[PDB]
Scaffold this active site. Sequence first.
Site, PDB file in Angstrom:
ATOM      1  N   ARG A 239      40.916 -37.363 -34.157  1.00 51.22           N
ATOM      2  CA  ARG A 239      39.833 -38.310 -33.899  1.00 51.22           C
ATOM      3  C   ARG A 239      39.808 -39.533 -34.799  1.00 51.22           C
ATOM      4  O   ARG A 239      40.130 -40.632 -34.364  1.00 51.22           O
ATOM      5  CB  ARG A 239      38.460 -37.641 -33.948  1.00 51.22           C
ATOM      6  CG  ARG A 239      37.311 -38.660 -33.868  1.00 51.22           C
ATOM      7  CD  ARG A 239      35.939 -38.009 -33.893  1.00 51.22           C
ATOM      8  NE  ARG A 239      35.791 -37.052 -32.805  1.00 51.22           N
ATOM      9  CZ  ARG A 239      34.837 -36.134 -32.752  1.00 51.22           C
ATOM     10  NH1 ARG A 239      33.946 -36.045 -33.726  1.00 51.22           N
ATOM     11  NH2 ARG A 239      34.781 -35.302 -31.730  1.00 51.22           N
ATOM     12  N   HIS A 285      40.531 -37.812 -21.906  1.00 55.23           N
ATOM     13  CA  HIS A 285      39.621 -37.843 -23.042  1.00 55.23           C
ATOM     14  C   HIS A 285      38.189 -37.568 -22.597  1.00 55.23           C
ATOM     15  O   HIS A 285      37.417 -38.499 -22.381  1.00 55.23           O
ATOM     16  CB  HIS A 285      39.731 -39.218 -23.700  1.00 55.23           C
ATOM     17  CG  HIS A 285      38.874 -39.394 -24.920  1.00 55.23           C
ATOM     18  ND1 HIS A 285      39.341 -39.176 -26.198  1.00 55.23           N
ATOM     19  CD2 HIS A 285      37.592 -39.810 -25.051  1.00 55.23           C
ATOM     20  CE1 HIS A 285      38.375 -39.433 -27.064  1.00 55.23           C
ATOM     21  NE2 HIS A 285      37.305 -39.817 -26.394  1.00 55.23           N
ATOM     22  N   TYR A 330      30.237 -54.745 -15.995  1.00 55.69           N
ATOM     23  CA  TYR A 330      30.473 -56.181 -15.841  1.00 55.69           C
ATOM     24  C   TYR A 330      31.887 -56.653 -16.205  1.00 55.69           C
ATOM     25  O   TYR A 330      32.499 -57.452 -15.504  1.00 55.69           O
ATOM     26  CB  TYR A 330      29.532 -57.002 -16.726  1.00 55.69           C
ATOM     27  CG  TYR A 330      28.068 -56.794 -16.432  1.00 55.69           C
ATOM     28  CD1 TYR A 330      27.401 -57.608 -15.540  1.00 55.69           C
ATOM     29  CD2 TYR A 330      27.353 -55.798 -17.067  1.00 55.69           C
ATOM     30  CE1 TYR A 330      26.068 -57.415 -15.274  1.00 55.69           C
ATOM     31  CE2 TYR A 330      26.022 -55.599 -16.803  1.00 55.69           C
ATOM     32  CZ  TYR A 330      25.374 -56.420 -15.918  1.00 55.69           C
ATOM     33  OH  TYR A 330      24.171 -56.248 -15.656  1.00 55.69           O
TER      34      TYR A 330
HETATM   35  C1  LIG Z   1      16.405 -53.519 -17.872  1.00 57.15           C
HETATM   36  O1  LIG Z   1      15.807 -53.556 -16.590  1.00 57.15           O
HETATM   37  C2  LIG Z   1      15.810 -52.243 -16.155  1.00 57.15           C
HETATM   38  C3  LIG Z   1      14.636 -51.514 -16.248  1.00 57.15           C
HETATM   39  N1  LIG Z   1      13.416 -51.978 -16.761  1.00 57.15           N
HETATM   40  C4  LIG Z   1      13.488 -51.983 -18.202  1.00 57.15           C
HETATM   41  C5  LIG Z   1      13.615 -53.429 -18.573  1.00 57.15           C
HETATM   42  C6  LIG Z   1      12.751 -53.792 -19.757  1.00 57.15           C
HETATM   43  C7  LIG Z   1      12.699 -55.293 -19.831  1.00 57.15           C
HETATM   44  C8  LIG Z   1      11.919 -55.783 -18.641  1.00 57.15           C
HETATM   45  N2  LIG Z   1      11.823 -54.647 -17.700  1.00 57.15           N
HETATM   46  C9  LIG Z   1      13.181 -54.210 -17.364  1.00 57.15           C
HETATM   47  C10 LIG Z   1      13.115 -53.265 -16.201  1.00 57.15           C
HETATM   48  C11 LIG Z   1      14.591 -50.211 -15.830  1.00 57.15           C
HETATM   49  F1  LIG Z   1      13.432 -49.529 -15.951  1.00 57.15           F
HETATM   50  C12 LIG Z   1      15.711 -49.620 -15.312  1.00 57.15           C
HETATM   51  C13 LIG Z   1      16.863 -50.363 -15.219  1.00 57.15           C
HETATM   52  C14 LIG Z   1      18.017 -49.673 -14.647  1.00 57.15           C
HETATM   53  O2  LIG Z   1      17.895 -48.516 -14.299  1.00 57.15           O
HETATM   54  C15 LIG Z   1      19.280 -50.390 -14.514  1.00 57.15           C
HETATM   55  C16 LIG Z   1      20.522 -49.753 -13.949  1.00 57.15           C
HETATM   56  O3  LIG Z   1      21.585 -50.439 -13.876  1.00 57.15           O
HETATM   57  O4  LIG Z   1      20.333 -48.551 -13.634  1.00 57.15           O
HETATM   58  C17 LIG Z   1      19.292 -51.648 -14.933  1.00 57.15           C
HETATM   59  N3  LIG Z   1      18.215 -52.290 -15.468  1.00 57.15           N
HETATM   60  C18 LIG Z   1      18.455 -53.661 -15.812  1.00 57.15           C
HETATM   61  C19 LIG Z   1      19.770 -54.280 -15.469  1.00 57.15           C
HETATM   62  C20 LIG Z   1      18.561 -54.581 -14.634  1.00 57.15           C
HETATM   63  C21 LIG Z   1      16.960 -51.671 -15.625  1.00 57.15           C
END
Ligand SMILES: COc1c(N2C[C@@H]3CCCN[C@@H]3C2)c(F)cc2c(=O)c(C(=O)O)cn(C3CC3)c12
Lengths: 692, 711
Positions: A239, A285, A330
Amino acid sequence: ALPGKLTREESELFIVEGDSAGGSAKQARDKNFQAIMPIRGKILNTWEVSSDEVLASQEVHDIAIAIGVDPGSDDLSELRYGKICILADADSDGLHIATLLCALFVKHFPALVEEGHLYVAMPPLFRIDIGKDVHYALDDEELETILKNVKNPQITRFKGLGEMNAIQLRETTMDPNTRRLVQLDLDDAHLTAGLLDKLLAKKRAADRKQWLEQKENRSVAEFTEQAYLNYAMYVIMDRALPHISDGLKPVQRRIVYAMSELGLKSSGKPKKSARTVGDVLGKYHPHGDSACYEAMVLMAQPFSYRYPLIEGQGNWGSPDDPKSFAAMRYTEAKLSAYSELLLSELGQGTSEWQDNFDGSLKEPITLPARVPNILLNGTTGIAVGMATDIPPHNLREVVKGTIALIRNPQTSDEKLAEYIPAPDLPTKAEIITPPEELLKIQTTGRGSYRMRAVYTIEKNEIVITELPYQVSGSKVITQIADQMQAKKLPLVVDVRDESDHENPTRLVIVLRSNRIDAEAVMSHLFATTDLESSYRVNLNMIGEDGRPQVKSIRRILLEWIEIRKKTVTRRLQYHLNRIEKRLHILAGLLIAYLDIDTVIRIIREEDQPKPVLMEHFNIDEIQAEAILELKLRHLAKLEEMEIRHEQDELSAKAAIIREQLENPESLKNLIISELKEDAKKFGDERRSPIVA
Amino acid sequence: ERKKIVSGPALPGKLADCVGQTREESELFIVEGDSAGGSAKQARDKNFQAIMPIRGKILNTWEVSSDEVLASQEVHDIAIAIGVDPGSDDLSELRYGKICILADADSDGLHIATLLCALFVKHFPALVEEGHLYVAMPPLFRIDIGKDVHYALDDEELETILKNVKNPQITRFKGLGEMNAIQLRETTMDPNTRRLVQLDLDDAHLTAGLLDKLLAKKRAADRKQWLEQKGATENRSVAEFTEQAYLNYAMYVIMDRALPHISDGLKPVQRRIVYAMSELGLKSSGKPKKSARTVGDVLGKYHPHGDSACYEAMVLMAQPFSYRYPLIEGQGNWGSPDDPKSFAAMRYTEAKLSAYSELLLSELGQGTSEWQDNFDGSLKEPITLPARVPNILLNGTTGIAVGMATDIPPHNLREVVKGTIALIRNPQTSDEKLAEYIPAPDLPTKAEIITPPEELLKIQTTGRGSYRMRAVYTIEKNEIVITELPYQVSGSKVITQIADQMQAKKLPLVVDVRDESDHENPTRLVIVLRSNRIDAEAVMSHLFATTDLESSYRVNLNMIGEDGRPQVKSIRRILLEWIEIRKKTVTRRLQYHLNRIEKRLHILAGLLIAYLDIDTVIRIIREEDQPKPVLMEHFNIDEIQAEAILELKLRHLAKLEEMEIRHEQDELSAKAAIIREQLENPESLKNLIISELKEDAKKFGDERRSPIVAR
DNA sequence: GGTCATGAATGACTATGCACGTAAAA
DNA sequence: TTTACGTGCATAGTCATTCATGACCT
Ligand SMILES: COc1c(N2C[C@@H]3CCCN[C@@H]3C2)c(F)cc2c(=O)c(C(=O)O)cn(C3CC3)c12
Ligand SMILES: COc1c(N2C[C@@H]3CCCN[C@@H]3C2)c(F)cc2c(=O)c(C(=O)O)cn(C3CC3)c12
Ligand SMILES: [Mg+2]
Ligand SMILES: [Mg+2]
Ligand SMILES: [Mg+2]
Ligand SMILES: [Mg+2]
């Protein structure tokens, strides 16, 4: 009271490792008398923490609140459960957490294992299915035990609790009438408390090193040592530490090899990161994917890696904020062209191969470096009993070194140092250590070196264009403005971060008047900010001997050359042993091309025509078939004289090769040329200059 | 200036600000998501351009009140950042010269720009009116013809660039996250090379009139209709732009996201997963393999999206308790019926394909489906699957698009195979008659379907409707034992619902609720009454109207049919329309196997033609410069058959291998005959498909689980 | 004597779009 | 009538703590 997260001697608390086995066991359990609890992540090392502090750490706090007892409290009177069970992974990290757990007990709740309330639940490592006749193997030994005794059986490995269905979980570790389960016994305090101190004493790591090199019911001591040893050795070998050949940790190689097998050569296009990581876990892995992806970011980061192994597309962090990189859903990436040096000779049998975690594939144990990566890329990790830090070096500088070392293997370190003065870091800031001391660092492996940012003066403003290895421009601006707020410096007016596409770095520090002695301010800052920084040097690594050593710079090169000699060899053996088996076929072929008619006769005339062809032309099993697999188009007079010249090349290529094997000295010239070549292909000048 | 006491809000900090304090020289880029954040933060020109991540889809504020708007944190920061008060024309303190919406060049990115425009049009009109709102247009492609780069905003502009075009290598920018800083800078940020639309709000009336139509939680009606009806160098109108943009989104999420297709009956995230799993050869007969590899491959080569989102849609297909017929077989923790979302993280689990799944996949390699370019034209993917059976009505789908949604209950395989075998022969079958076969849903539970038949049939003939289910229980003493829960009702929620009554003195007639359950007994909720004299019938036929032990179920047979258009479809209609699809599939297949048999038969022809005068064959190759033309002229066989002989292995010159290729000619000859009859004759086709349904409803079939009942 | 940071190991929370029907109330 | 729920597939940064060890730090 533990809400949500969570007779009396009939009762048993199940402490399982992580939210996976959380859900599973909570299912597996017998609701009547079996309560469940996830221990999430590795818990704190409690061995030197005060009972009062110990409860401050929430995950620790919660166990106490659950068993209904108190740290350093003989008061077992409110004890909530009859039997407390450590339900861990089958792997090392599994037993480690368990060890970290016994520690929380032995020390803060001795009473518990004293009266004997602590139990280590034993999950199977394997599961065999003869027809339908199930078995479970707790380890490797029992697997053999079971295998010489029976349809053909079908193994499944349990790479940990989450991938086990609740039904097989209960049967193997939950329900009392089939659950393997040890009653761990404390015994004497002194041998125990003594042994665990040696183990988990933040002060005592030194003996640990040694210890390793030296090293139903089981005893707390007997067991928590059997485990922690299992742990240690794993994280040292497989590791945290590099091997020397390619200079790679395992997740590091596994990534890079996985990336190869997804065809990601530098010449082509990138492909989502999720998929590379998706494959790395999928087949080589089986651990974190986040961890993985992050170890894959490092390799792709220009500013962290002297010679990147990976070339990422999209956000892969900034020099100012390395950790700012975008999520794996991404980024896309391929390989660096520099990574050719680690991989191009892989297909050509130059490497051991071992297997993967379910035998369904093979992964290579090391890669055929064409150069000594361990020194160019360098490494930095923490194991157990020891760790490793290794500074990046200049490719060309290190190639000269090895070229020299190949010719004359007695080359003084004093001389060698004339070739590879100092690490060469990804930035242009100065390496400011005395020659004397760098030589000490090199010859001794242990050591320390300093770097200093680069500046000039303009009026009452100090202009900085180079920061030292791994120092974020901002953090410097932070540290600076901290003294301003603390009022340690009443000398500064502002700190402007000019910077752009044109100047990667450009931190302007504005003094008060064009009267102030910047030199002092800068000289001061050097000794109070990261504009000057120190860097660890611990040349540890797994060597060809398979063991961990702290090696010299000359040593590392010497030993590597022994590894490159052995590689280029394997390789020529490879090529030759084909050219032969092939020249062999050619041989027999144009034997038929003489008497081609008989061959056709013999074929149309005979039942099994293969042994006829062998007796008639005096050709063996292997040539008989090459002919029977000769397409008609080949009988052409053209394609005949064509495979006669192919004999020419082949047979010359072979002489050239077996001479190379035969003669240690004409080999060194080969390897010396192949170094001189790549140093030209993938070399670059020095960046961080060396001063006084 | 002065040492105030009441002070303003600190500033969001997730704002990466510029240094230049001039008002007009400034610009704020409001970028979709944290990746694009870091990358933009890199690309920008520190001096006059500040950056701020919007994370997630901001709320739809087109009906939220200015006072409430700042409720929502992410909306709070856009107001604190631009320095302006919602529903206020007070621009006097406005922090930036231009506000720039910088989203992905994808559908979802166009949506987060629409919501953003709403926020402005409605709560910052002053700003939009003074033309401070801008939309940066990141390019969707980069063509690298020679050493000279070309960028295209969309598909139209790609058409123009290549048709004017030594070979072009195209690259899709699936979204800002994966652009590199230099490329972002050049294209979207840096003024002297960036494409940047100015938005005008020139007549509020039309505008707010329109946005109401799209963004108002009630006019889903008009949207559905509106959809069926539509299917800075330059400025655009907030209205012109947000209609264009909301339409793209509405369209995309209908077609390529939430609703399933009628054929196999899947939504894209599902089909892509299952195919991806096939392509890893995760056949049902074989071992499972880490989930993180399946999803690793899915986003790697088919579905360029969230891995978690995707993984989770994968979990569902694995769950015995939610999929009537699982398409995946999950190994390890995949949730409990009592806590469906409790499933292990993806780094933990392994899964292979459901045995069942073959009904969708077995016929794939045999020319049955259309194939389309994956998102970077480096692989192909099936547009639909060769469903052997009507999965759409067996497993069912549930989703929400825009202007419409779709809810579709699982069914019994055997009943539905029956129900179609019917329709194949009799295309006039009455709904009544068919409903005799397909009485109603069949859920993964043994609880009872308690809706009237009279009424279930309406559900089937309109596709719209509603049916209810109820739990199965017994009385022993003063305790109610419950063994079967309704489809997707959690034991725990029930217990919890229950305790809320007790806790608020509404059921003092129960003194405990214990959940007995285990290996031998899946479910056994025990309710503990008080006096043994109490009428548990009441208790329960009271609970049946106050806990989810009796719970309702939505029916909306909306889906994409062969027409490629969304419809609501009778259960009868669906099966009739599905038959025409399996018809065409089976067809396609026989043509495939035929057209290979023929091509082969053709090779064997010219082959045993040479066996006659095989010696001439050998001399002619040995004798000529290029032997192909000669053999052809000499034996009267074509370019194709010549090559074949030329590629005849010597081992074939043996007398055995000759008679051998004779047989194979006979074999094939018969096979192809059987096949062309089947193509040639419409009713022998139905017979085939009829047969294959019976086979499969035998192989993978099962009996009903949830009984139909009256109450 | 006490902190800090270093890279590999051990994932649940959180807000929000959209349709639209159930449910609890004003 | 109205407001609060649930549903799946879309758009990730935050949190603790192992282990070895030399330099800040405050
Ligand atoms: C950060 O946004 C998310 C939230 N909330 C928490 C964040 C806090 C700041 C303002 N509110 C947002 C909404 C959330 F609850 C779940 C997911 C989520 O599951 C997800 C994914 O790819 O699964 C992706 N995203 C972000 C990429 C969109 C989420
Ligand atoms: C919640 O577990 C984690 C924590 N927290 C968990 C602990 C208890 C609750 C929250 N406080 C601490 C920190 C954390 F900080 C980091 C990681 C982490 O990086 C990681 C990974 O796979 O990379 C995985 N995990 C999960 C496997 C545990 C992490
Ligand atoms: Mg593990
Ligand atoms: Mg992590
Ligand atoms: Mg997007
Ligand atoms: Mg999510």
